[PDB]
Ligand binder design. Structure first.
Ligand code: ADP
Ligand code: ADP
Ligand code: NA
Ligand code: NA
Lengths: 578, 578
C-alpha cells in the first residue's frame, strides 16, 4: 500500500530529494554557533601574540562572517526548505482529490443509495488531508533523524567499540515496543476518523433536512441524536489519546534506559582500567546525538501511525466497485431510431430481497409514445431507470436499436436519453446555470428557447435578476411547478432521441400543465417517448398505455381499448370523474 | 474575542493549570542526565578521596537512582502530561460543537436558503478542530518557553547588566517582525479555510445531486467545475504556505543575530575591560537557553495565527442572527379552537425584491377546511409557511385564537401545526424512525396506527425488514407515493389542532389518493385545515376555496358558487374535462 500512496508522490520525487538535501545542509548551521564561541575565546585572546588592533580586526571579519552566513545564506535555506516541503505535499493532496472526485462521479446509484454524503466527504477531505503528515514527517524528516543516528553511532564506533554496544542494547527493545503499539494506534485512529465521519454524515443530513426538524419542533430530540454521535466521536478520540499518551511514555522509558546503561558502563570501564577517562568524557558527550533522534522518532512514529490509518480509509473508498462498468466492448453508439426492446427483464435491487420487476416483455417502436401507469410502488420508475442503465437488469436484456444497452458506452447511452425524474434536482446556482445542465455547451439563445418551451422563460423574467437569479440551495427559492419546469427545460436543451418523463407534471397547476402538454406533444411528435403518470388524463393520447401491478405488466392498450376492457385500467381512470 | 473562546475553556482551568505544572516539572529530567554525567566524571572519577570500592559504590547509588527516576517516576509524568493536555482540549472541542449544533437548529429557513451546507459543516468541523492548537500550543506550551526565557535572562542580568543589553537588543525587532506578519497570515489562513469550505460545499451539493450529473453524462463538465474549486483551494493554500515560509525565515534571521551581537560586543568589551573571558565565556553557555525558546516561539506564533483565523470563522458563524426570534413575550399557548386570521398580510423575502403576498385578508373559523388554488408561483406555499411562522410577515398580522403568531413560543406554535410540505423529507433511517419524527415519544402501536391511516402500513410490511426497513439516504429506497405517504403518517402521529397540506398527494396514483382522501376527510372532520392543491377534484368538498393569482386573492367561494361565477376558478376547473 505504501507503493500505492507513493504513486501520487512519484512526479515530485526530485522536489522531495531537494527538500531532504537542503534539510541536511541545516545541521551545519547550529554547529556554527559553538564554533564561533571558540574563535574569539581561543583565537583573539588566548592566542596571546596578537596586536590589540590586529585582534580587534579579526573579530570584525569573524563578526563579519557570521552575520553574512546568518543574515544572507541561512534565510534562503530556511525558506526554500519549508516552502518546498509544503508546496510539494499540498500539490500531492490536490492531486489525490482530483482523482477521488472522478472516482465518486463514477460510483453508481446503488453506492449512493447506501452511503452517507457527509461520511464520503469526510474521507475525500479529512482523511486525505491527514495523509499529509506521511509526506512531511515520513518522507522528509524521519531520514534526517536516521542520518543523525548513523553519524552518531559511527563517531561512537571509533571513540570505542564496546561503549557504543553499551548503547545499542536498547535499540532492539525500542523497536519491539513500537511494533507492539503501532497496530493498536492505527486502529484507534481509524475508528476515531470514522466517528468524525459519522458526525459529518449526521450534520449533512440534518442541516439539509431541517425543514422537518423545524416543523415538528423536534430540535431537542434531534439535538440529542446529535450528542450521541458527537459523544461517540469524543469517546473514540479519547481512547486514541490515552493510547498515544501510553505508548509515548513507553517508547521513551526504553529510549531513556539508553544513556543510563551507557554512562553506568562507561564508568565501570574507565575505572576498571579499560579506557581513557577522556574517552568516557568524549563519548558521553555524544549521548545527545544518539538518544535525541531516537526520542524524536517516537513522535515521528506516532504521527505516521495516524497517517496510515487515514490513507487506509482513503484507499478503502478508492477501492469501491463501480456497479455499472463500461467493459471492453464499450462503443459510442448513435441511436438513430428510438427502438427499445425489453426482453424478459427481471430486476432485484439485492439478492436477499424479492424482485421488483419480474418478467417484463415490451417492445417500443421509434416514434411511439408509451405510458406507464399503476398503483404506486409498482415498478414504473425502477423499470424506467433501467434504460439509462442506472442499474443493470438482473435477468434479461434491454436493447435499443438492437444494441444491448450494456454495449453502449455509458455517457453515450445516457446522453441520448432525456430524463425528467420525479424528484428533480437544482444546484444553488443561477436559473440559466441550471438549465445549462441539460447541454453545458449551449447558446444563451438556445437556453431561452428551451425555457420558452418548458413554459419557464416567462416567470424567469419576473425573477429578480431574471435568468441570472440565483435559485436557492437545492433550488428552494422557486415554486414546485417552477423547479419542475426548469427540469423540463433541460430536456429540450438536451433534445435527445429518447425522452423519459417520470411524472414530469407533479407540481404544476391545471393550466401550466396544458401548456407543457402542448410543448411536449410537439417535441414528442417523432421521438420515442416513455411516460410514467398518475394524472391519467395527460396520457390518453399515448400510443400505448401499459398498466403495471406488483412488478408486472397487467394490461396493454389504447386508452379507448383499455376503457372498453373494463379492466385494471378502466378501474383507475373510472375513479376520476366518479 | 480571546475572552469568548476562553469561556469554553473556563470549566477546565484547573486541568490546564495542572497540565502546565507537570509541564514545568519536566525540564528537571533532561538536566538529570548531564548531572549523572558530571557526577560520574567530576564526582566519582576525580574525587581523589575514593577507595576503588567507594567510587564504584557511589557510582552505583547514582545509577540505581537513575533507573528508578526514569523507569518509574518519568513515565507517569510523561503520560499524564499528554493525556491531560489532550483530554482537556478534546472535551472543549466537544463542547463547542454541542453549542454550534443548537445554533444551527436555531437559524431560519432564510439562512439555509442562502447558505451552503457543506460550507457550514466545514466550519462546525474543520474550523473548530483548528482552534485546538490554540489550547495546546497557546495556553499550555507558550508559557514554558517564556518561563525558560525568564530563567535564562535573570542569569544573564546578574552575570553582566550591560551584556544582557547586547542580547535583549534583538528582542524588540523580533516583536516588531512578528507583528508585521501576524495579521497577513491570519487573513491568508482565513481565506484558505474558506476555500476548503467551498470545496466542501461543492462536494456536498454534487455528490447529493449526482442523479442529474449521471443523467446528462455531464461528469466531465462538472469534474471541471470541481477542479476550479479544488484549484482555488490549492492556490490560496500555497499563498498561505509561501508567507509562512517567508515569515519564518524572517523572525529567525532576527533571532539569529541574537547570539552574534552578544559575541560582537561581548568580545569587544572583554578587550576594553568591561569584564574578562571568565565572564564572556560563561555568558555564552546559556545562549541556548535564550535564543532557543525564541526560536520555538516563532513556530508557536505561526500555529496560533492560523488558530485565530479559525476561531474567527467559528465565531462568525456563531454570530449569525436568528431571523425568527422568540422575544420576551414568549408564551407556550394551547390552541383550543383553530381560529386563524390573516389581516392585511404582505410578504417579501427581501427588501430589494417585490412582495410575493401583497394584501391578504382571510378568516378561517375552527373546523373549516380551506383550499388554496392558483397558477404555480402564485404564493400559496409562501402564504402557508407564514403560519408556522417560518418567515415573519412583512406588513400585517396573522392571529391564531386571537393571539398573534409572534406571541407564541416557536416550538409551541409549530408543534400544533401538522405540516405536510410539497417537497417532503426522509432521513436515512428506518421507516418507523421516520414516522416517529411526527411524535418521537410514540408507541410502536400508535405508529402502526398512523401508518394504517396514511395508507402506509400495508406496503411497509411488504418491505424487506418491514417497519424496520432502512429507507435510503434522502429516502431513495421508496416510491414517490411511498415517501409521501410516510409524510402523511407523521401528521396523524402529530395529531395537531391545525393541519396544513401543501399538495400532499403529488405522487400518488388515483386509487391511493382516494384512500388518503377518506383517511383525511376523517381526521379533518373537526380540525382547521388549510390545503394547497393543483388536482382540483380533491378540493371540491372544501368549505371555502381561495383562488390566488400574482400574490393576490382573486376569488373566494364554494366549489358550487365559484363554478357558477364562471370566473377565475371555473376557468381552471373547466380545463379538466375540456
Ligand atoms: N433506490 C432503491 N433501493 C432499493 N429499493 C428501491 C429503490 N427504489 C425503489 N426501490 C424499491 O422498488 C419499489 C418502488 O418501485 P416504484 O419506484 O415506486 O415504481 P413506481 O415509481 O412506478 O411506483 C419500492 O417498494 C422499493 O422497495
Ligand atoms: N426559499 C425562498 N427564498 C426566496 N424566495 C422564495 C423562496 N421560496 C419561494 N420564493 C419566492 O416565492 C415565489 C413562489 O411562491 P410559490 O411558492 O410558488 O407559491 P406557490 O407554491 O402557491 O406556487 C417564487 O417566485 C420565489 O421567488
Ligand atoms: Na413520441
Ligand atoms: Na375540517
Amino acid at each position: 500500500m505504501i507503493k500505492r500512496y507513493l504513486q501520487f508522490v512519484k512526479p515530485y520525487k526530485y522536489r522531495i530529494f531537494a527538500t531532504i538535501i537542503v534539510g541536511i545542509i541545516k545541521f551545519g548551521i547550529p554547529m556554527l554557533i559553538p564554533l564561533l564561541i571558540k574563535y574569539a575565546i581561543d583565537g583573539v585572546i588566548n592566542n596571546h601574540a596578537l596586536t590589540t588592533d590586529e585582534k580587534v580586526h579579526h573579530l570584525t571579519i569573524a563578526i563579519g562572517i557570521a552575520l553574512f552566513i546568518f543574515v544572507i545564506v541561512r534565510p534562503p535555506i530556511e525558506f526554500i526548505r519549508q516552502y518546498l516541503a509544503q508546496w510539494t505535499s499540498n500539490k500531492i493532496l490536490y492531486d489525490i482529490r482530483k482523482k477521488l472526485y472522478n472516482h465518486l462521479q463514477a460510483l453508481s446509484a446503488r453506492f449512493y443509495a447506501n452511503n452517507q454524503v457527509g461520511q464520503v466527504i469526510s474521507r475525500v477531505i479529512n482523511d486525505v488531508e491527514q495523509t499529509k503528515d506521511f509526506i512531511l514527517t515520513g518522507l522528509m524528516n524521519i531520514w534526517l533523524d536516521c542520518i543523525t543516528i548513523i553519524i552518531a553511532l559511527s563517531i561512537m564506533f571509533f571513540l570505542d567499540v564496546k561503549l557504543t554496544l553499551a548503547a545499542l542494547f536498547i535499540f532492539p527493545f525500542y523497536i519491539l515496543t513500537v511494533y507492539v503499539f503501532f497496530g493498536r494506534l492505527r486502529k484507534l485512529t481509524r475508528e476515531r476518523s470514522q466517528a468524525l465521519a459519522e458526525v459529518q454524515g449526521f450534520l449533512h443530513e440534518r442541516v439539509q433536512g431541517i425543514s422537518v426538524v423545524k416543523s415538528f419542533a423536534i430540535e431537542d430530540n434531534e439535538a440529542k441524536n446529535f450528542d450521541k454521535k458527537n459523544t461517540n466521536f469524543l469517546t473514540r478520540a479519547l481512547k486514541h489519546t490515552r493510547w498515544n499518551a501510553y505508548s509515548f511514555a513507553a517508547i521513551n522509558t526504553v529510549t531513556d534506559i539508553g544513556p543510563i546503561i551507557v554512562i553506568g558502563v562507561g564508568a565501570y570501564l574507565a575505572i576498571s582500567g579499560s579506557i581513557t577517562v577522556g574517552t568516557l568524557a568524549a563519548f558521553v558527550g555524544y549521548l545527545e546525538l544518539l538518544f535525541g533522534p531516537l526520542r524524536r522518532l517516537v513522535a515521528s512514529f506516532t504521527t505516521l501511525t495516524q497517517s496510515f490509518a487515514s490513507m487506509d480509509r482513503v484507499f478503502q473508498l478508492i477501492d469501491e466497485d463501480y456497479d455499472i462498468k463500461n467493459g471492453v466492448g464499450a462503443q459510442p453508439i448513435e441511436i438513430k431510431q428510438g427502438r427499445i426492446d425489453i426482453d424478459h427483464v427481471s430486476f432485484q435491487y439485492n439478492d436477499n430481497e424479492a424482485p421488483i420487476l419480474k418478467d417484463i416483455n415490451l417492445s417500443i417502436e421509434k416514434g411511439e409514445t408509451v405510458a406507464f401507469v399503476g398503483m404506486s410502488g409498482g415498478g414504473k420508475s425502477t423499470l424506467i431507470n433501467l434504460i439509462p442503465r442506472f442499474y443493470d437488469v438482473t435477468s434479461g436484456q434491454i436493447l435499443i436499436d438492437g444494441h444491448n444497452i450494456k454495449d453502449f458506452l455509458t455517457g453515450s447511452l445516457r446522453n441520448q436519453i432525456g430524463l425528467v425524474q420525479q424528484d428533480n434536482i437544482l444546484f444553488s446556482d443561477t436559473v440559466k446555470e441550471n438549465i445549462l445542465l441539460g447541454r453545458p455547451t449551449a447558446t444563451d439563445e438556445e437556453v431561452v428557447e428551451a425555457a420558452k418551451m418548458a413554459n419557464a422563460h416567462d416567470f424567469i423574467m419576473n425573477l429578480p435578476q431574471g435568468y441570472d437569479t440565483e435559485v436557492g440551495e437545492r433550488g428552494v427559492k422557486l415554486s414546485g411547478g417552477q423547479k419542475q419546469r426548469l427540469s423540463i427545460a433541460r430536456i429540450f436543451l438536451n433534445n435527445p432521441p429518447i425522452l423519459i418523463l417520470d411524472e414530469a407534471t407533479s407540481a404544476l397547476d391545471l393550466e401550466s400543465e396544458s401548456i407543457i402538454q402542448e410543448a411536449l406533444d410537439v417535441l414528442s411528435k417523432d421521438r420515442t417517448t416513455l411516460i410514467v403518470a398518475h394524472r391519467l388524463s395527460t396520457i390518453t393520447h399515448a400510443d400505448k398505455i401499459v398498466v403495471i401491478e406488483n412488478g408486472h405488466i397487467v394490461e396493454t392498450g389504447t386508452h379507448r381499448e383499455l376503457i372498453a376492457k373494463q379492466g385494471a385500467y378502466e378501474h383507475l381512470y373510472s375513479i376520476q370523474n366518479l
